[PDB]
């Protein structure tokens, strides 16, 4: 005889699902923390509803396996616990245990209730010499008849792939097996099967020929990372292309629910290109709304008075959950947009050459600039002439009013920089310009001023086929001007570079280098590292809600009818080109230090703070991020050496080795024969690999994503597509620059409808949910009983707080004005913590939006 006491903490569906959470149109950071033991609806879990069965960790049966200790059904609700949270419900359960039937280390759970629930945790108040044994669950439990195998959950202690407790070695290998799933069938909602598949979901051949898109991945031309496998039948008119669907599968638990209504920022997107985009396209295709902005004064009226809309649309969008606040409205007829930080102090400073060069260092896309080593700039294209030629920017185009010295001197002293956007677009420039869009293949040189500020020198506007093709060097360079038509020409020359930059930032810097590249790691980790594994615990939080956002992405963002194809320059060839750029992606080069060196923005110097010397030290992104990357690198190292006693210990880890093999050969399989892949044979290799994953999921994504609306919320500052070529000679358009240069500008960039779609999308993306878990020492509960890892994590959070303070002081340092610029916008993109809204700060643990 004997009875172990258990406290089961769970959350009902009603507390976490959107359709029902339609009633949380307000602040619910708590609100009594309604236990459910309140307004007892929790008696339903009391009948013969839920059974738990403890499993032994120190006592095995006949053939290997651990030992089951009877099935026990729930009983009573514990109405209040000091550690009880909002939306949570707690239940008491006494298991009959007995020494000889050792110490528990896992448990099976059966849900008989039909409607699923979210199991939070289980805590046992033992018998032998043990304190409370805690089980961190955080998993949705569906009815027991549809699983073939019982849902099992392990205890707190993390064990290496030895799988340690012999009685649980079988239970560990089996759960992992179940996570993989054979690679067969159409995946269902309640399933937890992680598998790979190529990008063949984006297009829709059945609806036409114009609706087909190239298969990405699994070929030489368009190599690409794998995405989470879903098992829909092929498309009728194409067997290698998967049929579309309004509901895309992703393993359950990977789809995070929320307590508050406006925290479902994914249901925001899905509802915008669904019930906001179709309706708005009918407002333009009428007359209640002008199709083109007439002046600069009209674009700004978007944040003040807003776009007076008809009730035929403005009330059909008004209810819609999550879209609470965002789509401001004075009641009837008005779809207002909040003012971006870029125009709050000065609405005219975005036009300066300084807040153009400045944004390449502290902007939305700050990791593309590079030091010029040998002028003129060269193309990396093939036997196409200019790719064997170079840029047509003469040694005679450089050095204006600033200082004045030779070209070679400016290079030996490393003051000349480049912002090359030539290669990626050139190959498709013929096809793209043959549509409503008209773009250039841009190149721009920058000079490092004596006062640390960067200044534009020459902008090269290239076009394909000077006469035929094989040459492509049909370019023209433009120089900076301050008055007359020359300035209105230079203003447009910058608009041609930005249209290229925001699109490169679109699918590459943001979608490719972050979103797409990370998904394969989530799948490889879940398929091969047991939840009990140390590396699984270190990585886990940085994968939060990632397969969910990428699922929506394939559904509404980067698909055939998508939002990215309508709003961006590359248009229909958007993702294909990112597959082309992917050819150049190198894992180890994603490391911040290695990236800075590769672009020539830094030189190794041990005498310096982080082992590297920076050319242009007034580089916010780089300077701030180096502190953060370092913090990550120190934390992973402390953590990895905490578990691995030697290198051989790593090599003989079957879970990690099977994980790395599959990630290389399958996840990012198109690059399997690449030599730069770390060969998990060293401990500092695992350290590096984990640091790059975490950097990418948190700090890289934050820098590249949260400054989207603050900088690009003004379509003027960061336009997404160009429709006209540069006005020439005496044309009625050249003369229009003279008459009305603002109309000239507006007719050269994103039209009104696409401007309104762009803003409503990057505005959702640029916001933090109120329940976001940041890098700042943040985690949900107590993921491990390993006190040493607990302390190492506390140390991580501490240095994150010092760094935060450290970063604020730099923003106040009047000598580093590349942090603020003419726009007075303190670069706070890399500060660890942040509050709820559209704050221009905060580093989430992962790619959550």
Could you give the residue numbers annotated as active site?
Answer: 510, 515, 701, 705, 849
- Determine if residue 533 is labeled as part of a ligand binding site: no
Distance (Å, whole) CA 740 – CA 307? 23
Residue from the set 515, 527, 544, 633 that interacts with ligand EGT by CB under 6 A: 515
761 binds, among ligand EGT, Fe ion, none (CB under 5 to 8 A by kind): ligand EGT
Mark the segment that binds ligand EGT (CB under 6 A) among 9-17, 226-234, 465-473, 500-508.
Answer: 500-508
Q: Which stretch binds ligand EGT (CB under 6 A): 415-423, 441-449, 463-471, 501-509?
A: 501-509
Of 50-58, 154-162, 553-561, 779-787, the window that binds ligand EGT (rule: CB under 6 A) is 553-561
Residue 349's binding partner among Fe ion, ligand EGT, none (Cβ under 5 to 8 angstroms by kind) is: none
Instruction: Report residue 97 as tokens.
Output: 């245990």
| Window contacting ligand EGT (CB under 6 A); options: 47-55, 220-228, 485-493, 550-558 | 550-558
The pattern of x and - marking residues 757 through 776 that bind ligand EGT according to CB under 6 A reads: ----x---x-----------
Of residues 530 and 556, the one with the C-beta less far from ligand EGT: 556
Q: Which is nearer to ligand EGT, 765 or 790 (CB)?
A: 765
For 73, the 3-state DSSP assignment is: strand
Q: Which residues bind Fe ion (CB under 5 A)?
A: 705
258 is in an annotated binding site: no
CB of 272 to ligand EGT, least distance (A): 9
Residue 510, annotated ligand binder?
Answer: yes
Which of 7, 89, 506, 760: binder of ligand EGT (CB under 6 A)? 506
CB of 763 to ligand EGT, least distance (A): 10
Closer by beta carbon to Fe ion, 156 or else 705: 705
Residue with CB nearest Fe ion? 705
**Residue 367 is assigned to a ligand binding site:** no
Give residues 251-270 in contact with ligand EGT (rule: CB under 6 A).
Answer: 269
Integer Cα distance of 126 and 728 in angstroms = 84
Nearest approach in angstroms of CB 510 to ligand EGT is 4
Q: What share of the chain is helix, strand, coil (3-state, %, to 5)?
A: 35, 15, 50
Considering only residues 153, 511, 585, 629, which one is a binding residue for ligand EGT as defined by CB under 6 A? 511
Selection from Fe ion, ligand EGT, none that 506 binds (CB < 5 to 8 A by kind) is ligand EGT
**CB-side neighbour CA atoms (13 Å) of 72:** 23
Task: Name residues whose C-beta falls within 8 Å of residue 55's C-beta, 6 or more positions apart in sequence.
Answer: 66, 67, 68, 69, 104, 105, 106, 107, 108, 152, 167, 168, 171
The listed partner (Fe ion, ligand EGT, none) that binds 397, CB under 5 to 8 Å by sort, is none
Where do the H-state alpha helices sit in 291-399?
296-300, 311-314, 341-344, 354-357, 359-362
Query: Phi and psi of 729, rounded to 5°?
Result: 30, -105
Residue 715 in 3-state DSSP?
coil
Residue 549 is a binding residue for ligand EGT (CB under 6 A): yes
Residue 725 DSSP one-character state: P
106 binds, among ligand EGT, Fe ion, none (CB under 5 to 8 A by kind): none
Helix (H) or strand (E) holding 745: helix 741-746
Residue 515 in marked binding region? yes
Strand boundaries in 560-696, DSSP class E: 602-604, 612-614
Please say which residue, 89 or 705, places its beta carbon nearer to Fe ion. Answer: 705
Residues 458-497, mask of contacts with ligand EGT (x by CB under 6 A): ----------------------------------------
Give the one entry of ligand EGT, Fe ion, none that residue 553 binds, where binding means its C-beta sits below a cut-off of 5 to 8 angstroms depending on kind.
ligand EGT
- Least Cα distance to 474 among 735, 726, 748 occurs for 726
- The Cα 649–Cα 322 span in angstroms is 49
Residue 783 in 3-state DSSP? coil
Q: What is the DSSP letter of 837?
A: S
- Structural tokens at position 546: 């990632």
The answer for residues whose C-beta is within 8 angstroms of residue 166's C-beta and 6 or more apart is 60, 64
Nearest partner of 295 among 680, 731, 716, 789, judged by Cα: 716
Of Fe ion, ligand EGT, none, which one sits near residue 568, judging by CB under 5 to 8 A according to partner kind?
ligand EGT
Q: Are the C-beta atoms of residues 816 and 683 closer than 8 Å to each other?
A: no
Cα separation, 588 vs 668, in Å, equals 14
**CB nearer to Fe ion: pick between 488 and 705:** 705
Rounded to whole angstroms, the Cα distance separating 736 from 484 reads 12
Does the bond joining 376 to the residue before it have cis omega, within 30 degrees of 0? yes
- Is residue 375 a contact partner of residue 390, using CB atoms and an 8 Å limit? no
Residue 750 near which of Fe ion, ligand EGT, none (CB within 5-8 Å, type-dependent): none
Q: Is the separation of the CB atoms in 170 and 61 below 8 Å? A: no
Q: Which of 564, 616, 656, 699 binds ligand EGT (CB under 6 A)?
A: 564
Q: Work out how close the CB of 847 gets to Fe ion at its nearest, in angstroms, rounded to a whole number.
A: 6
Question: CA-to-CA distance for 824 and 827, rounded, in angstroms?
Answer: 9
Q: Judged by CB, which is closer to Fe ion: 391, or 506?
A: 506
Per CB under 6 A, residues contacting ligand EGT are 269, 505-507, 510-511, 515, 549, 553, 557-558, 564, 568, 708, 761, 765, 849
Q: Could you tell me which residues are annotated as the binding site for Fe cation?
A: 510, 515, 701, 705, 849
């Amino acid at each position: 005889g004997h009875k172990i006491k258990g406290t089961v903490v769970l959350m009902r569906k009603n507390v976490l699902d959107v359709n029902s959470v339609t009633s949380v149109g307000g602040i619910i950071g708590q609100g009594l923390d309604l236990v459910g033991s309140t307004l007892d609806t929790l008696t339903a879990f009391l009948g013969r509803s839920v059974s738990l069965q403890l499993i032994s960790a120190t006592k095995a049966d006949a053939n290997g396996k651990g030992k089951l200790g009877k099935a026990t059904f729930l009983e009573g609700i514990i109405t209040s616990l000091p550690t009880l949270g909002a939306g949570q419900s707690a239940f008491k359960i006494n298991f009959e245990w007995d020494d000889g039937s050792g110490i528990p280390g896992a448990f099976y759970i059966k849900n008989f209730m039909q409607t699923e629930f979210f199991l939070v945790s289980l805590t046992l108040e033992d018998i032998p010499n043990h304190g409370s044994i805690h089980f961190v669950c955080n998993s949705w439990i569906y009815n027991a008849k549809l699983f073939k195998s019982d849902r099992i959950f392990f205890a707190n202690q993390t064990y290496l792939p030895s799988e340690t407790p012999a009685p649980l070695v079988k239970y560990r290998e089996e759960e992992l097996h179940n996570l993989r799933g054979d690679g067969t069938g159409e995946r269902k909602e309640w399933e937890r099967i992680y598998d790979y598949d190529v990008y063949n979901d984006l297009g829709d051949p059945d609806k036409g020929e114009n609706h087909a898109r190239p298969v990405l991945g699994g070929n030489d031309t368009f190599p690409y990372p794998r995405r989470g496998r879903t098992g829909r039948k092929p498309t009728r008119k194409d067997p290698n292309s998967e049929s579309r669907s309004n509901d895309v599968y992703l393993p359950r638990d990977e789809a995070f629910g929320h307590l508050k209504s406006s925290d479902f920022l994914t249901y925001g997107l899905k509802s915008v290109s669904q019930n906001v985009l179709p309706l708005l396209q009918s407002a333009f295709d009428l007359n209640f709304t002008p199709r083109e902005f007439d002046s600069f004064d009209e674009v700004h009226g978007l944040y003040s008075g807003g776009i007076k809309l008809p009730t035929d649309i403005i009330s059909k969008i008004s209810p819609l959950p999550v879209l609470k606040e965002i789509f401001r409205t004075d009641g009837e007829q008005a779809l207002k947009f909040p003012p971006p930080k870029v125009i709050q102090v000065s609405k005219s400073a975005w036009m300066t050459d300084e807040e153009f060069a400045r944004e390449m260092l502290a902007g939305v896309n700050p990791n593309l600039i590079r030091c010029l080593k040998d002028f003129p700039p060269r193309s990396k294209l093939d036997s196409q002439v200019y790719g064997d030629h170079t840029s047509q920017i003469t040694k005679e185009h450089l050095e204006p009013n600033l200082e004045g010295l030779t070209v070679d001197e400016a290079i030996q002293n490393k003051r000349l920089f480049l912002l090359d956007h030539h290669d990626p677009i050139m190959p498709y420039l013929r096809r793209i310009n043959a549509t409503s869009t008209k773009a250039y293949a841009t190149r721009t040189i920058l000079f490092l001023k004596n006062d640390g500020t960067l200044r534009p020198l020459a902008i090269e506007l290239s076009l394909p086929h000077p006469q035929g093709d094989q040459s492509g060097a049909f370019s023209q360079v433009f120089l900076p001007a301050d008055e007359g038509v020359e300035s209105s020409i230079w203003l447009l020359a910058k608009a041609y570079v930005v249209v290229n930059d925001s699109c490169y930032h679109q699918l590459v810097s943001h979608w490719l280098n972050t979103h797409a590249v990370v998904e394969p790691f989530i799948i490889a980790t879940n398929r091969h590292l047991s939840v009990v594994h140390p590396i699984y615990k270190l990585l886990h939080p940085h994968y939060r809600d990632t397969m969910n956002i990428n699922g929506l992405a394939r559904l509404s963002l980067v698909n055939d009818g998508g939002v990215i194809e309508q709003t961006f320059l590359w248009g229909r060839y958007s993702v294909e080109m990112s597959a082309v750029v992917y050819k150049d992606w190198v894992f180890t080069d994603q490391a911040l230090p290695a990236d800075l060196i590769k672009r020539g923005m830094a030189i190794e110097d041990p005498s310096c703070p982080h082992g590297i010397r920076l050319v242009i030290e007034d580089y916010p992104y780089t300077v701030d991020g180096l502190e953060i990357w370092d913090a990550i690198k120190t934390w992973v190292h402390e953590y990895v050496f905490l578990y691995y006693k030697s290198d051989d210990t790593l090599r003989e880890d079957p879970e990690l080795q099977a994980c790395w093999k599959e990630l290389v050969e399958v996840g990012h399989g198109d690059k399997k024969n690449e030599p730069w892949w770390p060969k998990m044979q060293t401990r500092e290799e695992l350290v590096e690999a984990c640091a790059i994953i975490i950097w990418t999921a948190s700090a890289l994504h934050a820098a590249v994503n949260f400054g989207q609306y603050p900088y690009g919320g003004l379509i003027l500052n960061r336009p997404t597509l160009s429709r006209r070529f540069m006005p020439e000679k005496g044309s009625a358009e050249y003369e229009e620059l003279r008459k009305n240069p603002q109309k000239a500008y507006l007719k050269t960039i994103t039209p009104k409808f696409q401007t309104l779609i762009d803003l409503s999308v990057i505005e959702i993306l640029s916001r933090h949910a109120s329940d976001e878990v940041y890098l700042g020492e943040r985690d949900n509960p107590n993921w491990t009983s390993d006190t040493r890892a607990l302390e190492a994590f506390k140390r991580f959070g501490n240095k994150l707080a010092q760094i935060e303070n450290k970063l604020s002081e730099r923003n106040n340092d009047e000598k580093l004005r590349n942090r603020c610029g003419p726009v007075q916008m303190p670069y706070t993109l890399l500060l660890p913590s942040s509050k709820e809204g559209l704050t221009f700060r905060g580093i989430p643990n992962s790619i959550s939006i």
